[PDB]
Design a binder for these strands. Structure first.
Lengths: 299, 496, 209, 199
DNA sequence: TCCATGTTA
DNA sequence: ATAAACATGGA
């Protein structure tokens, strides 16, 4: 009687997102001092925007468009979200209007104020930044054209790196049962994420699922904490395999299925026989999420 | 009419109000020293009296004419002529500061005046009070009281609520995530009209491609007052004990590099004065906290950059007193201030400044490193300001041995003989330059865990004492930093 | 106190109450936020949730009585990770802005703010048996938090008097705030005390809420 | 309705990209870290330029060319004659100013921004290299006919390495406006991709 | 409420 | 290199 939540990881590839805050003639990316080192990060807002973009791409109706305007970035094509259906897919439906639609006298619907479903965390890298730098040609557009030229040509430089990202869902409750079809579509959209960051078309980075593993009974999250993991290793495996071997009877491994994409290639039989005969199938994320939805329709 | 106001320092929500109390008290004290003030007192029956001045509270008694006189003195202003490639610009007088800035040309005041136009009154609609009092002669009996009456009406019931305007230099009318308005007291809003005269101002800057300082905005320093009577007694000489040397059209001391530098500077002046002025408690007993604001104007809008709270600890003051000794500190070694911050008490001792010092030095100053040696890089950090200490010293020995032995093996010319005869120093020095910079750039790139140690073959090319691989194979960064920085020690000294 | 429980979290943010155009943060959460988090974790819904331009109109007549302290184990640093967040304009609000009126929130403008690298808290609650029981039922009944009360003790906080100059104290703090015209909360400054011993009775504060 | 993307590689041979960003005496190539080793890079801008060049060669309508006759290199046909009606691959070049061809509204109703149909990525090697590899030589001067008068007389070095490298790419799916021959010609140009190098 | 305006070493 | 995207109190 809950909503399951998990953690995803991405295949390594060069970074794309330049996070502005440019100083002198260089573009940089924000860092965090996790243990005195550098790490590239992404705010959850970009993932929310990209997921809504995939929802509109799949054909699910919505009532909001962010279109490329010539003057300044803005969002339009939105009307009063009177029904919870046909709008915003049961999430992110804010409103702060001071005088609107006779409040509820003729709206006759809930204010939809300070409401959210599927609150997601923010992405973190797994490898420290080594102070890389790649220079940049950047010649002037023209010396004779009618259009301007910035009066000169410069020589820029930007930094890139290759690093995977991990990302938790943090979706719980049971109120999201009005539209199970919408839930399945949203799960498929997450499974089919690509170009989540707004970084740039060239050198594009895409978030494909890679060994997404987490589950729990109708109790609040604990145990693995979604972070504190090593890089390009078996953090999934080492962490939860060790915990479950220590907690085979303490926590139910039947509902909390297997972990790690590498163990799908070797020692799968030994781990399965030592732990349980549960629904620990792991071949591809697509069919995995398919059976998650199959088991979730009943709950 | 007679009105009495009582204030307690503990009830103030922000340190700005605490500064406002001291500013108002200093305003009254300075105003009590003018012949025209007492002439108006004896003519129009002006009431102004501080009743209970102590460490914990304050009491004031005043009439309407007292408020008129205070607003006449505070909002005094005149007009100044500037040229263009002509126009009139109204400039505030500056109040009691005009009587304390003994620097030539009152250059400090100028910066202060500039700041008052930059951030204080960015919205021109708030410039009305200075427009009315332009050219007025208080010695000739000129006065203005139209706006004073409204303030008097409001102060008649100070306990009533009101709305914060932009006169508070932080936040907006409601921040306006939604329609919220704001909460404040009329008496509290009155206090904010005078704290701007106590704040300290410094000019930050950035470095361009050519290394020239480009100034942007200002840094405002606000003290937190613990004992009011002590503070108001000590500040008049603290201001008077400032340096007067000017760089260009700005004071040399006015130039700072990081927002926290000015906070240290102000309390350093305070610590100088506590030795100069006795009878008071320690700096903690005088100042509880320091507030630093970074601001800059952009068009018809005002943007903030950094807000922070500091601590008055003296052990950091002792360390900071060392940096000013070195003359013309390069902006790279200057970054030593950044690493000043049961975990981070002794983090400075490892000097892990190779990374960020290299990052900026690469881009525009790899070209400029040959120019003036940035005053010998403060003798290359004063030549490390002179077995882990022996581990640091062997790097210095090895670099010098390498450069000397390699330069000798190239042509067998010795600086001992070169210094003896004239007209041959710079030909030797040019080869020294071109033999050191190539190695420095070779170590500049191609740096990682394993490849770096293979470059040590070149360092010992013309070639106990081995029981340190348990450090070299493990750190790989401290040793790299030392080999990078100490190699610049052998870089030639400037002719002058 | 009856008993206390420990928790940790990797990321969090505590905005000053109407900080301004540019946001900021404090090293430790406000007492009101902690009280609200504990009340919600037990499953106790908010006493009043009326709707309008604003909310949070809370009398104290029907509200649990309780005493809360605060603790801290490991210092944490801060970072700034943001570039934009739209607002609601003040002024003409000209052209289309007035044309749309669809829960407006238009005129997106850049702005930065701060975050905390890590966070850990230790303090619990002194409360009657029934409240603790229903809190346990809310936690376990029909990131991670668990009670390690007796061991693993660290530094604490306490209001400071005009003496005994502290170190690295919190500039401001909030006790009980309602989003209306009021006097807000009385005491602002707080001071940390470092000793591996039970916090003094001064650390415990009986919350009016 | 249908998307496509592929990763392609080539045959081993010495390196070809050269920029000389380090110094006159020593030339270097861009270097990237990977699991503690180092690898070579070919930036996507070079492939964009090469694709433009082959679209020039394959008898396709063009809206950009160079001049190679200026002290500092620039582009002429991209910005001077063309109001950006139809780019090479609908790239619809952008630039901001106080106005652009009468605010680019009345004369030609197009957005200021661009389309960016193509989706490329950085090219990376497959095996690491190691430090300097080859010597070099330079002359003294012209001598009698003094017109060059460089008077350098130096023995510089060059950096070479042998490696075959690969790179991915992707294409949009639902783009079909004026596609039938344009996109297939672009694909045919990709098929060869001959003249791409830093030198 | 609405509708009156301001530039440099 | 452009490159831009706010406030007061006034009848």
């Amino acid at each position: 009687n809950l909503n399951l939540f998990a953690t995803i990881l991405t295949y390594p590839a060069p970074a794309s997102n330049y996070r502005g805050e440019s100083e002198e003639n260089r573009s940089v990316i924000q860092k965090i001092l996790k243990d005195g080192q550098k790490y590239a990060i992404i705010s959850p807002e970009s993932m929310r925007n990209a997921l809504r973009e995939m929802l509109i791409e799949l054909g699910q109706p919505n009532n909001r468009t962010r279109l490329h305007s010539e003057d300044q970035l803005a969002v339009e094509f939105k009307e009063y979200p009177n029904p919870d259906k046909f709008a915003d897919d049961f999430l992110f439906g804010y409103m702060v209007a001071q005088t609107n639609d006779a409040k509820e006298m003729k709206k006759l619907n809930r204010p939809a104020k300070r409401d959210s479903i599927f609150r997601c965390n923010m992405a973190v890298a797994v490898n420290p930044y080594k102070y890389d730098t790649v220079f940049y040609q950047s010649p002037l557009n023209a010396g004779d054209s009618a259009w301007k030229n910035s009066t000169s040509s410069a020589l820029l430089h930007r930094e890139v790196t290759h690093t995977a990202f991990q990302y938790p869902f943090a979706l719980a409750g049971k109120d999201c049962a009005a539209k199970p079809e919408w839930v399945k579509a949203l799960l498929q959209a997450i499974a089919e994420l690509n170009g989540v960051a707004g970084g740039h078309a060239r050198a594009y980075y895409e978030f494909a699922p890679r060994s997404v593993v987490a589950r729990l009974t109708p109790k609040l999250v604990a145990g693995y904490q979604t972070y504190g993991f090593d890089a390009e290793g078996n953090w999934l495996e080492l962490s939860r395999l060790t915990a479950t071997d220590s907690d085979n009877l303490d926590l139910p491994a039947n509902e909390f299925w297997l972990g790690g994409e590498l163990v799908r290639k070797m020692d799968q039989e030994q781990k399965a026989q030592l732990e349980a005969m549960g629904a620990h199938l792991y071949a591809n994320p697509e069919k995995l999420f398919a059976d998650l939805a199959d088991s979730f329709l009943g709950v | 009419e007679i009105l009495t106001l009582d204030f307690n320092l503990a009830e103030l929500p922000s340190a700005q109000h605490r500064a406002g109390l001291a500013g108002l008290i200093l305003m009254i004290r300075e105003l009590k020293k003018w012949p025209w003030f007492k002439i108006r007192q004896k003519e129009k029956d002006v009431l102004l009296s501080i009743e209970n001045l102590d460490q914990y509270g304050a009491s004031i008694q005043l009439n309407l004419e007292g408020l008129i006189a205070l607003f006449d003195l505070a909002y005094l202003s005149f007009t100044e002529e500037r040229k263009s490639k002509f126009y009139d610009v109204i400039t505030p007088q500056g109040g009691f500061l005009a009587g304390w800035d003994k620097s030539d040309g009152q250059i400090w005041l100028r910066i202060w005046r500039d700041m008052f136009w930059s951030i204080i009154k960015g919205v021109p609609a708030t410039r009305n009070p200075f427009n009315n009092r332009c050219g007025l002669n208080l010695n000739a009996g000129d006065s203005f009281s139209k706006d004073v009456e409204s303030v008097w009406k409001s102060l008649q019931n100070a306990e009533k609520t009101t709305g914060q305007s932009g006169a508070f230099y932080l936040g907006a009318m409601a921040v306006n995530a939604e329609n919220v308005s704001t909460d404040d007291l009329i008496k509290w809003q009155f206090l904010l009209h005078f704290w701007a005269f106590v704040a300290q101002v410094y000019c930050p800057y950035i470095l361009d491609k050519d290394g020239k300082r480009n100034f942007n905005g200002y840094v405002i320093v606000i003290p937190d007052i613990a004992n009011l009577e002590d503070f108001c007694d000590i500040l008049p000489d603290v201001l008077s004990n400032r340096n007067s040397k000017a760089f260009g059209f700005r004071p040399q001391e006015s130039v700072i590099d990081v927002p926290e530098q000015g906070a240290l500077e102000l309390l350093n002046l305070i610590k100088q004065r506590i030795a100069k002025k006795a009878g008071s408690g320690l700096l903690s007993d005088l100042i509880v906290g320091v507030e630093v604001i970074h601001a800059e104007k952009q068009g018809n809008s005002i943007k903030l950059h950094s807000v922070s709270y500091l601590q008055p600890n003296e052990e950091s003051v002792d360390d900071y007193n060392a940096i000013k000794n070195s003359y013309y500190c390069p902006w790279f070694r200057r970054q030593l201030l950044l690493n000043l911050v049961l975990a981070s008490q002794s983090w400075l001792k490892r000097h892990p400044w190779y990374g960020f010092g290299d990052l900026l030095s690469r881009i525009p100053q790899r070209w400029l490193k040959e120019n003036n040696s940035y005053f010998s890089h403060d003798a290359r950090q004063l030549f490390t300001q002179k077995k882990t200490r022996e581990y640091a010293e062997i790097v210095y020995k090895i670099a010098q041995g390498f450069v000397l032995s390699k330069l000798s093996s190239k042509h067998d010319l010795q600086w001992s003989k070169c210094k003896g005869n004239p007209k041959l120093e710079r030909e030797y020095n040019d080869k020294k330059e071109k033999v050191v910079n190539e190695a420095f750039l070779a170590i500049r790139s191609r740096t990682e865990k394993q490849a770096f140690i293979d470059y040590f073959v070149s360092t010992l090319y013309p070639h106990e004492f081995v029981d340190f691989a348990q450090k070299l194979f493990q750190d790989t960064d401290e040793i790299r930093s030392l080999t990078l920085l100490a190699l610049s020690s052998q870089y030639p000294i400037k002719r002058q | 106190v009856t008993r206390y429980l420990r928790l940790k979290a990797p990321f969090a943010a505590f905005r000053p109450f109407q900080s301004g155009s540019f946001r900021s943060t404090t090293p430790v959460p406000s007492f009101s936020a902690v009280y609200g988090l504990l009340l919600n974790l037990a499953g106790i819904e908010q006493r009043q949730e009326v709707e309008g331009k604003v909310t949070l109109i809370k009398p104290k007549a029907e509200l649990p009585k309780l005493a809360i302290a605060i603790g801290q184990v490991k210092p944490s640093s801060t970072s700034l990770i943001n570039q934009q967040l739209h607002n609601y304009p003040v002024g003409n609000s000209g052209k289309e802005f007035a044309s749309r009126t669809f829960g407006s929130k238009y005129w997106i403008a850049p702005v930065r703010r701060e975050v905390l690298v890590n966070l850990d808290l230790i303090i619990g609650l002194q409360s009657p048996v029934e409240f603790w029981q229903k809190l346990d039922q809310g936690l376990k009944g029909e990131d991670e938090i668990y009670p390690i009360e007796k061991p693993d003790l660290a530094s604490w906080y306490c209001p400071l008097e005009p003496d005994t100059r502290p170190n690295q104290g919190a500039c401001r703090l909030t006790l009980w705030i309602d989003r209306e015209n009021n006097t807000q909360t009385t005491i602002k400054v707080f001071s940390p005390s470092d000793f591996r011993l039970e916090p003094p009775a001064k650390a415990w504060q009986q919350l009016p809420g």
